[PDB]
Amino acid sequence: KPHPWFFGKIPRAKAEEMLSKQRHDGAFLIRESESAPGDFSLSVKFGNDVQHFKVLRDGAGKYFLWVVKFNSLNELVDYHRSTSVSRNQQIFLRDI
Ligand SMILES: NC(=O)CC1NC(=O)C2(CCCCC2)NC(=O)[C@@H](CC(=O)O)[C@@H](c2ccc(C(C(=O)O)C(=O)O)cc2)/C=C/C[C@@H](Cc2cccc3ccccc23)CNC1=O
Numbered sequence: 001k002p003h004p005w006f007f008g009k010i011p012r013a014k015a016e017e018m019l020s021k022q023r024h025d026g027a028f029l030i031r032e033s034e035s036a037p038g039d040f041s042l043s044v045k046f047g048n049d050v051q052h053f054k055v056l057r058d059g060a061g062k063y064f065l066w067v068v069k070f071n072s073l074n075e076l077v078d079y080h081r082s083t084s085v086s087r088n089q090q091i092f093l094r095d096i
């Protein structure tokens with residue numbers, strides 16, 4: 001499990017300066033959080049800036065960027081038109 005995407009204590013500013021010069025949107029790194037001891041931040045090139053996400057943890061110690069839950073069945077459906085419903089195959093929802 002190589003982690004060439006991990007850049008340790010790279011400051012937020014330097015991560016932005018590095019990601020700015022990348023050719024593709026989605027170019028990214030993970031780095032230690034600026035403020036939170038033991039936490040990680042994900043930095044991603046998107047168009048003409050760089051977005052930062054906190055790498056969230058739950059009580060079981062799992063890692064995630066947002067909790068994927070929906071307010072309506074329709075919302076669930078709309079999501080899985082473009083994100084697979086299967087955990088092992090590529091299967092998108094399509095109108096019957
Ligand atoms: N990186 C991956 O894609 C790995 C797996 N994850 C999935 O397919 C995923 C994530 C991507 C989108 C589809 C759903 N998620 C899951 O399957 C899930 C569960 C699910 O139903 O979606 C993942 C999981 C279970 C429980 C928690 C929970 C907790 O630990 O208390 C919590 O809230 O923190 C969290 C996550 C189960 C893994 C068991 C896995 C089976 C398993 C593997 C190795 C060891 C054990 C040991 C015990 C039980 C099961 C396993 C199935 N899941 C995967 O292999």
Ligand SMILES: NC(=O)C[C@@H]1NC(=O)C2(CCCCC2)NC(=O)[C@H](CC(=O)O)[C@@H](c2ccc(C(C(=O)O)C(=O)O)cc2)/C=C/C[C@@H](Cc2cccc3ccccc23)CNC1=O
Binds near residue numbers: 033052053065
């Ligand atoms: N996984 C995610 O980041 C999803 C969220 N983020 C967003 O909605 C985003 C998604 C990218 C586009 C802008 C909006 N990002 C942000 O809002 C932000 C905004 C930003 O970039 O300033 C994201 C963030 C804050 C600060 C850092 C910082 C550090 O960790 O000390 C660093 O650069 O190392 C990094 C990231 C804030 C999270 C606060 C979050 C609250 C929070 C959660 C857990 C621990 C702490 C701890 C302290 C403060 C807040 C939190 C709310 N935001 C989100 O959950």
Ligand SMILES: NC(=O)C[C@H]1NC(=O)C2(CCCCC2)NC(=O)[C@H](CC(=O)O)[C@@H](c2ccc(C(C(=O)O)C(=O)O)cc2)/C=C/C[C@@H](Cc2cccc3ccccc23)CNC1=O
Binds near residue numbers: 001003006
């Ligand atoms: N959650 C995961 O599955 C990630 C890792 N775990 C493993 O592959 C596993 C997990 C179960 C089977 C044995 C090997 N574990 C390990 O490799 C290891 C260690 C090992 O040989 O078991 C994992 C580790 C280090 C130290 C502790 C712990 C203790 O020693 O009691 C403590 O509190 O210090 C616990 C775990 C090292 C991680 C660094 C990793 C390298 C690393 C170092 C520093 C920063 C980063 C940042 C991002 C990714 C990886 C790293 C190697 N380990 C992994 O990638």
Ligand SMILES: NC(=O)C[C@H]1NC(=O)C2(CCCCC2)NC(=O)[C@H](CC(=O)O)[C@@H](c2ccc(C(C(=O)O)C(=O)O)cc2)/C=C/C[C@@H](Cc2cccc3ccccc23)CNC1=O
Binds near residue numbers: 008037038040063
């Ligand atoms: N719990 C502790 O306080 C002692 C450990 N942790 C630290 O000192 C810490 C404590 C908070 C602030 C930064 C320094 N944390 C860390 O070092 C780190 C990473 C860091 O720089 O923040 C800890 C770590 C690695 C990877 C993950 C990873 C995963 O499990 O997938 C993830 O986040 O998803 C998570 C944590 C690395 C352990 C390797 C350890 C070295 C190591 C041991 C055994 C096998 C391998 C194998 C490969 C690389 C490193 C190691 C170093 N860390 C520690 O022993």
Ligand SMILES: NC(=O)C[C@H]1NC(=O)C2(CCCCC2)NC(=O)[C@H](CC(=O)O)[C@@H](c2ccc(C(C(=O)O)C(=O)O)cc2)/C=C/C[C@@H](Cc2cccc3ccccc23)CNC1=O
Binds near residue numbers: 060062
């Ligand atoms: N993780 C916890 O919160 C505590 C668990 N305690 C245990 O007894 C354990 C402690 C380690 C030694 C074996 C048994 N853990 C487990 O049962 C399992 C580990 C195990 O070997 O059975 C634990 C677990 C699941 C999946 C993974 C997986 C992943 O997330 O990708 C992976 O290995 O990569 C890792 C760990 C969680 C299961 C769901 C838990 C139930 C659950 C909650 C929320 C959503 C789902 C969704 C699907 C299935 C189960 C759940 C039952 N397990 C536990 O409560």
